[PDB]
Amino acid sequence: GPHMSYDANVIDDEAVKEVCEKFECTESEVMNSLYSGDPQDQLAVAYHLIIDNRRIMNQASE
């Protein structure tokens, strides 16, 4: 059979860890909506917003 299109090599494990504490959930729940659910789910929306925070808000203020 063919190779899979996604893997932990194409996720931000620091973002997943930040979603776990900020959203109050487990890594497997964060990874599920990114791997087998859809990006519009609240756990994947948290991952997107936390990657925006980690890049921008982390530098824009202190």
Tell me the backbone φ, ψ of residue 56, rounded to 5 degrees: -90, -60
Question: Would you kindly state where each structural domain of the chain is located, as residue ranges?
Answer: 1-62
The amino acid at 24: E
Method used experimentally: NMR
Question: Which DSSP symbol is given to 8?
Answer: G
Which tokens hold the place of 33? 């909506």
Those residues with Cβ within 8 angstroms of residue 38's Cβ, 6 or more apart along the chain or in another chain: 44
Superfamily of domain 1-62: Ubiquitin-associated (UBA) domain (1.10.8.10)
As given in the structure block, the two tokens for residue 60 are 């824009």
Report the C-alpha gap between 1 and 21 in whole angstroms: 38
| C-alpha distances in Å from residue 54, one per residue of 2, 10, 50 | 34, 17, 6
